[PDB]
Structures are given as C-alpha cells and as structure tokens.
C-alpha cells in the first residue's frame, strides 16, 4: 500500500460543438478511448469534457475498461452522493476499474473571465481496490484569460486550491490512507506560483521530476500549431500525492507525447488535418 497504483489524467479538449463545431470532438471521443495510453490504469481523470454528446460518447466508450464512473461535474445534482460549492458544466469526470464507495462534487466559488461561463470545480471519489481505500480528487482550475490580469487569475487559482484543501480537511480522511489530487492545475512548473501551489494543496513535486517537458506545447502539438502557434510551451497538468496522508516510497509523473491516428475536419470549403488526441498531452502518475 499504495503499491502498483496508476492514474492517468488527460485534459481531452472537448469544447461545446454548438460554439466550436469543427474540432473533431465526436471522432476524438473514439480515438482517445481506443488509445493504448487509456488502458491499464486504476483510475482516469478527465478534464474539458464539456460538449454534452462527445463527453457522453467518451465516457461510454470507456465503460468496458472503467465501469465505475462519476458524472461530469457541474451538470446537476444527479449521480453524486453530495454536491457543494454558467453556460456549461465543469468538464471534469473520474472513472475507475474499481468500485466507487463515495463520490461528491464541489463547484468553485470564484471564477474569472470566460471561465465564469463554466461550472469549474472538482470531483472526489473514494475507491476500493482489493480491500484497500484510495482517494482521488480530479480538478481543472482557472486559466489565464486575455481579459483578466495574471495577478487576478493567480488569486482565483489560489482560492480554488484552498477550496480543495478545505474539503480535504473537513473530510477527516484517516492519515494512513492515500489522497491523490490531479488534473490541469493551470500553474506552470518551476514558477513562484508553482512553489506556492505546493503549499496551498499541501503536496510535493513527483520524484525525479522533469519540467523540461511541456504538457501544453505549441511547438509539437498539431492542434496548437493552428490555434496558438506563437505561445510559449507550458507544463500545467499534474497528479500529486497529498502530504498529510499516506505516501508511496516513490511517486512519479510522465508526460505522454503520443500522437493520435491522423484525422480531418472541414470548415467552410477547407480541410484541416491533425494528429493529436487533444491540445494537452496526457500525464501518467505511478509508484515505482
């Protein structure tokens, strides 16, 4: 204990097809669920599963491997043990090959810019694996927005990180049980804000961490080459172990740069062809 526990987190970039109809959402819901990186996990955390149909499709495709699932947060009170804490849901779901004995959602109380149009938050699950409990918080926090200052987006993320810690404190989870916190934290590795995030979530950097990677990379990602070709690569997606609770000897993160099969979309008269599952790369968290 925790043993050979493995979590993959992927911000899958499934925006509303009503607003962004031509980004391959329905097809990528198949490609992602068929990909090797989605196999052999204990738990999978999804982010940006916003589009109603594509997200339903993806979660459905994932049922074979991961039958125990939460709803996407911020849709309604249905399918949750508890709800606490907008054109759109929060885009976060958690799926498991292991039974879920508790699941609740918490919608963030602060938000800024375009993020105010979505019920962003976090999902909490308690799963049982072979007689042993595992606690997983999946989340997707406030982004930097052109129309809000970086001080403002930093403050909002700091408040949202506190929402997570307040929930964990209130939960009174036994210290001999492990808590994971993962998803797109929207804090770039190795910055002052990264330092502070460690304190606010009460976590440490995974072992032998390689930050030279980028989980959001316009220099390599075919979808970002189109939309943000000039932006600097960032490292934004993490899976952490909480420090006040049980820990493995070794906890690691690895960014997976795997390309998807080629896929194409049309907009007006023109064909656009891509080879990525999402604009973010998936991250795998594992004990050594």
UniProtKB/Swiss-Prot annotation:
The keyword Signal applies. It catalyses: a sphingomyelin + H2O = phosphocholine + an N-acylsphing-4-enine + H(+). It is an enzyme of class 3 (hydrolase). GO terms for molecular function: sphingomyelin phosphodiesterase activity. Keywords: Cytolysis, Hemolysis, Hydrolase, Secreted, Signal, Virulence. One of its GO terms (cellular component) is extracellular region. Disruption phenotype: A knockout mutant was shown to be weakly hemolytic on sheep blood agar, does not produce the external halo of incomplete hemolysis characteristic of L.ivanovii and does not give the typical shovel-shaped cooperative hemolytic 'CAMP-like' reaction that happens with Rhodococcus equi. Is also much less virulent for mice infected intravenously. Pfam families: Exo_endo_phos (PF03372). GO terms for biological process: killing of cells of another organism. Its main location: secreted. Complementation with SmcL of a mutant lacking the membrane-damaging determinants hly, PlcA and PlcB (thus unable to grow intracellularly) was sufficient to promote bacterial intracellular proliferation. Virulence factor that promotes intracellular proliferation by mediating the disruption of the phagocytic vacuole and the release of bacteria into the host cell cytosol. May act in concert with the phospholipases PlcA and PlcB and the hemolysin hly to mediate efficient escape from the vacuole. Belongs to the neutral sphingomyelinase family. This is Sphingomyelinase C. It comes from Listeria ivanovii. The gene is smcL.
């Amino acid at each position: 204990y925790p043993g050979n526990f493995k979590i993959t987190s992927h911000n899958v970039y499934l925006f509303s097809r009503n607003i962004y109809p031509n980004w391959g959402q329905m097809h990528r819901a198949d490609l992602i669920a068929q990909a090797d990186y989605m196999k052999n996990n204990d738990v999978v955390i999804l982010n940006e599963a916003f589009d109603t149909s594509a997200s339903h499709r993806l979660l459905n495709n994932l049922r074979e491997m991961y039958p125990h699932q939460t709803p996407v947060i911020g849709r309604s009170k249905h399918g949750w043990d508890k709800t606490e804490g907008a054109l759109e849901d929060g885009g976060v779901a958690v799926v498991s090959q292991w039974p879920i004995v508790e699941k609740s959602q918490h919608i963030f109380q602060r938000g800024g810019g375009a993020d105010r149009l979505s019920n962003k938050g976090f999902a909490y699950v308690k799963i049982m694996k072979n007689g042993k409990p595992y606690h997983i918080i999946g989340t997707h926090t406030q982004a930097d927005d052109s129309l809000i200052s970086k001080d403002t987006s930093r403050a909002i993320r700091a408040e949202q990180m506190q929402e997570i810690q307040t929930f964990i404190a209130k939960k009174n989870i036994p210290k001999d049980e492990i808590i994971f916190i993962g998803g797109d934290l929207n804090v770039n590795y190795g910055t002052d804000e990264y330092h502070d995030m460690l304190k606010l979530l009460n976590v440490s950097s995974p072992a032998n961490f390689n930050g030279q990677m980028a989980t959001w990379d316009p220099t390599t990602n075919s979808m970002l080459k189109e939309s943000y070709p000039k932006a600097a690569p960032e490292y934004l997606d993490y899976i952490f172990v909480e420090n006040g609770h049980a820990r493995p000897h070794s906890w690691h993160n690895k960014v997976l740069h795997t390309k998807s099969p080629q896929w194409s979309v049309k907009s007006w008269f023109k064909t656009y062809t891509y080879q990525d599952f999402s604009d973010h790369y998936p991250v795998v968290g594992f004990t050594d």
